[PDB]
């Protein structure tokens, strides 16, 4: 049915073998799956459940609770934009407008080429450098459209 590629199952095992108990590796395993596929593929949950020795029900409940995980839309690059108090005061709306101008999309949306998804997030813990956004693991202050444009050009 659904089996994980060899290069990926290796990494999941690394995670599972890392903590004293297998089940502690669920969040790291799910970060890995999402890093590999662009999202959490719904068919990945059953095989992972078996590797963690957990019920499928349990795993699905976990995916639902943790916001970073996305079971709906594949994207090569997730642009996490902070929509909390400080970034709002300092121009979250200017960043979103600039993202619309450049990429043609709004929060929740994916480019048609499946390259960028914009994900509104809560405070990213960089409030002094507001307004804040992440492109996958990379984090940045927004300054201008021109500056935004140059940064995004680095993601191919």
């Amino acid at each position: 049915e659904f089996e994980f590629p060899e290069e990926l199952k290796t990494k999941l095992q690394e995670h599972i073998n890392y903590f004293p108990k297998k089940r502690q590796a669920i969040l790291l395993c799910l970060h890995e799956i999402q890093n590999y596929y662009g999202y959490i593929p719904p068919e990945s949950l059953k095989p992972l459940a078996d590797m963690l020795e957990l019920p499928l029900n349990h795993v699905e409940g976990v995916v639902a609770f943790y916001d970073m995980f996305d079971r709906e839309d594949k994207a090569k690059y997730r642009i996490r934009v902070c929509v909390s108090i400080v970034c709002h005061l300092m121009g979250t709306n200017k960043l979103l407008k600039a993202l619309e101008n450049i990429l043609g999309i709004k929060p929740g949306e994916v480019t048609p080429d499946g390259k960028f998804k914009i994900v509104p997030v809560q405070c990213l813990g960089a409030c002094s450098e507001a307004p804040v956004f992440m492109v996958n693991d990379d984090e940045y202050k927004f300054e201008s459209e021109v500056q935004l444009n140059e940064i995004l050009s680095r993601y191919t």
Partner: protein
């Protein structure tokens, strides 16, 4: 050069040169650089002391918890060791409260200060397994800690029989996945056990029953970071730092409408006005301060800036998180943003919290957009005052607090929306 994700360079400044001695510089300080400033020597000293003596120094330091409840650290460790082992040690690195970005700079720039304090702390309480739980939106920190932990192992500060003391320790690093509740200590533990982050009814406290039912100390990153200093200087010198009653360095994350936003290591006798004007360089455009939001906990007006930044009955308290709003900033729109945070972060266990956080935000948006009925207004008032009942953690206790304060201190601005 070992490359980590891009991180903004948060500005950091210190008058005390302690938790920020290295972290005032926006770069990773690795083990050789840490060893050169006498790093890991407080560990070596601590390993020549009894666990009990360490507990006793930390107690006499008057060190209190920096995750924002201010519980005495030495007393917490005493409670854990009065219960039978095995015992567990957890560094709480979830930092997800709005306006809060101080714990991350220690992690990213001075990982070894933190690691050193974890080892001393673990030995003090007899724990042979420790954990850092770091939020998932802190990827660079995760990778920086993993590498620093390996450096520490290579140089022999982790593993079995650390420096011939007979004391074993492994530090495991866990990541979060988008939930502020997983910063609440019991919810954090549930997540470490591979579950959803639902808080447990307390008591029991984790020091009695925590990870796998066993005695567990949860301490905040910054709390732990003070431990190497207490062992290094002695408890007497630590208590000479700042006020007699509020001893030690405090990190203050200053954000919003200020000229110099960032992290300030200051003593606790500092006032809120001194933080914004003396340290953070005043306001953007020299506009008048309207309000300070203490993270998502409290709202101070411009008439309450000359309070001290201590746990004083009349002090700022909280975590010293200073978000500044100036005269042209819509307080109602700001409250909405605070309402939206709690709505996204309630775990749903308690019913008044689940529905109250939802409805507070839903109704406050109706108000903000001018589409609220008379009843929508009166309902909003009611729910804001009734999120707390039956709540098992502090989220539901505070989710209406800041907003209530805006209603009471900025009534004229709310009436404009009516």
């Amino acid at each position: 050069m070992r490359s980590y994700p891009a991180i903004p360079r948060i500005y950091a400044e210190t008058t005390l040169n302690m938790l920020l001695k290295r972290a005032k510089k926006p770069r990773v300080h690795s083990i050789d650089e840490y060893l050169k400033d006498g790093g890991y020597q407080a560990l070596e000293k601590a390993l020549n002391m009894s666990p009990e003596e360490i507990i006793d120094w930390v107690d006499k330091s008057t060190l209190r918890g920096r995750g924002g409840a201010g519980f005495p650290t030495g007393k917490k460790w005493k409670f854990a060791v009065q219960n039978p082992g095995p015992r567990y040690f957890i560094c709480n690195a979830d930092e997800s409260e709005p306006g809060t970005f101080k714990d991350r700079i220690i992690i990213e720039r001075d990982p070894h200060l933190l690691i050193e304090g974890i080892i001393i702390s673990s030995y003090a309480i007899g724990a042979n397994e420790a954990y850092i739980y770091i939020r998932g939106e802190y990827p660079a920190g995760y990778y920086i800690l993993r590498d620093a932990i390996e450096e520490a192992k290579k140089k022999g500060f982790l593993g079995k029989n650390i420096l011939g003391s007979g004391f074993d320790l492994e530090i495991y690093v866990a990541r979060g996945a988008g939930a502020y509740i997983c910063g609440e200590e019991t919810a954090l533990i549930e997540s470490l056990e591979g579950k959803r982050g639902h808080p447990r009814l307390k008591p029991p406290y984790p020091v009695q029953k925590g990870l796998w039912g066993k005695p567990t100390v949860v301490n905040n990153v910054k709390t732990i970071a003070n431990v190497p200093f207490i062992i290094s200087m002695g408890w007497e010198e630590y208590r000479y730092i700042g006020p007699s009653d509020y001893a030690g360095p405090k990190l203050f994350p200053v954000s919003g409408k200020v000229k110099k936003p960032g992290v300030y290591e200051l003593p606790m006798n500092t006032t809120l006005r001194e933080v914004i004007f003396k340290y953070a360089g005043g306001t953007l455009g020299n506009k008048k301060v309207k309000a300070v939001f203490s993270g998502a906990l409290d709202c101070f007006s411009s008439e309450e800036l000359d309070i001290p930044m201590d746990y004083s009955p009349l002090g700022f308290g909280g975590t010293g998180t200073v978000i500044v709003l100036t005269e042209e900033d819509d307080i109602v729109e700001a409250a909405l943003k605070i309402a939206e945070f709690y709505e996204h972060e309630t775990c749903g266990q308690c019913t008044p919290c689940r529905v109250g956080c939802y409805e507070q935000a839903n109704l406050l948006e109706k108000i903000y957009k001018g589409e609220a009925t008379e009843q929508d207004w009166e309902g909003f008032d009611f729910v804001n005052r009734n999120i707390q009942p039956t709540s098992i953690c502090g989220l539901g206790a505070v989710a209406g607090r800041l907003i209530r304060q805006t209603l009471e201190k900025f009534p004229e601005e709310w009436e404009k929306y009516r």
